[PDB]
Amino acid sequence: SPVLAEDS
Amino acid sequence: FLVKFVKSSGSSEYFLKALESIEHLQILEEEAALNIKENDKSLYICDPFTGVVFNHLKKLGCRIVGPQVVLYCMQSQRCVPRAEYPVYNMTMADVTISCTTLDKDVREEVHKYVQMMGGRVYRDLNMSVTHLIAGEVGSKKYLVAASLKKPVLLPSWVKTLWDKSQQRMMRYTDVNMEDYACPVFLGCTICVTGLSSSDRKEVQRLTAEHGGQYSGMNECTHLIVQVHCVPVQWFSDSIEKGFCQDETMYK
């Protein structure tokens, strides 16, 4: 996916 | 689309400089803009972004932009940002930020100023993000941005770009990234055990120099050994590569 690290 | 310059009090010189650079553009006096009662889907140039006029147009939902945006895009309509919020200038055009390990309210302030300076914001760290804004090291976002050697800057970088670009026209590279880089150990309290007194002093010094805290279990975040229990190679590699290293890679 384009997300490398999700939001906290 | 039509362009309506809104003459107002308190405006900066850049408003005038934008009028000296222009037929499908109207020039409205403050009064004619105060008598607007709907949203004609035209582009409104406002300066400043304070006052009953600006907040009136903003309340109506109007497309608002600052004169610095005009001086940036000139006669390129496509260059103008296409968003639901007013853009004051283009200092951060081409910047896409994400935030990590920040207070939610500060996070939203950062988002606000970036968007107002022509930048993009995402809540996740996707492949479009050009800059990571961090309040401290160690997060998944942080480690990922490090591995890709994306800049990891403090919030002040955004703030200083806002405050300065209020007076003059500039871009985000007109500030030195290094002076706003997230310190390698910001947010870390480093503790040691089994190290020579000399090495111990070195860890102290380098910790303080790279934004961390030294303390000689609840207080420590990392424990250097011969809480994260890591070897000294983690400390030295963190300093050498310019980012706090993934502790799980040093176990």
Residue numbers in the entry:
A (entry chain B): 380 to 387
B (entry chain A): 9 to 30, 37 to 230, 234 to 243, 258 to 282
What did the published study say regarding this structure?
Phosphorylation of RAD9 on Ser387 (or its equivalent) in its C-terminal ‘tail’ has been shown to be essential for interaction with TOPBP1, and required for an effective checkpoint response in a Xenopus system. We have now succeeded in determining the crystal structure of the BRCT0,1,2 module of chicken TOPBP1 (cTOPBP1) in complex with a peptide corresponding to the phosphorylated C-terminus of human RAD9 at a resolution of 2.3 Å. As determined by mutagenesis studies, the RAD9-pS387 peptide binds to the middle BRCT domain (BRCT1) of the closely packed array that forms the N-terminus of cTOPBP1. Unlike phospho-peptide binding to the more commonly occurring C-terminal tandem BRCT2 arrangements where the bound peptide bridges consecutive BRCT domains, the RAD9-pS387 peptide runs perpendicular to the long axis of the BRCT-domain ‘array’ and only contacts BRCT1. The phosphate group of RAD9-pSer387 is recognised by a network of hydrogen bonding and ionic interactions centred around the side chains of cTOPBP1 residues Thr114, Arg121 and Lys155, which form the conserved triplet common to all BRCT-domains involved in binding phosphorylated peptide motifs. In addition to these core polar interactions with the phosphate, the side chain of RAD9-Asp386 hydrogen bonds to the side chain of cTOPBP1-Lys118.
Bioinformatic analysis suggests that only three of the BRCT domains in the yeast TOPBP1 homologues, and four in the vertebrate TOPBP1 homologues, possess the required cluster of residues needed to bind phosphorylated peptide motifs. Despite the structural similarity of these phosphopeptide-binding BRCT domains, genetic and biochemical studies show that they are nonetheless selective and specific for the phosphopeptide sequences with which they interact. To gain some insight into this, we have determined crystal structures of segments of yeast and vertebrate TOPBP1 that contain the two most N-terminal phosphopeptide binding sites (BRCT1 and BRCT2), in complex with phosphopeptides derived from a number of different known ligand proteins, including RAD9, and used this to develop consensus patterns that encapsulate the individual specificity requirements of these two independent binding sites.
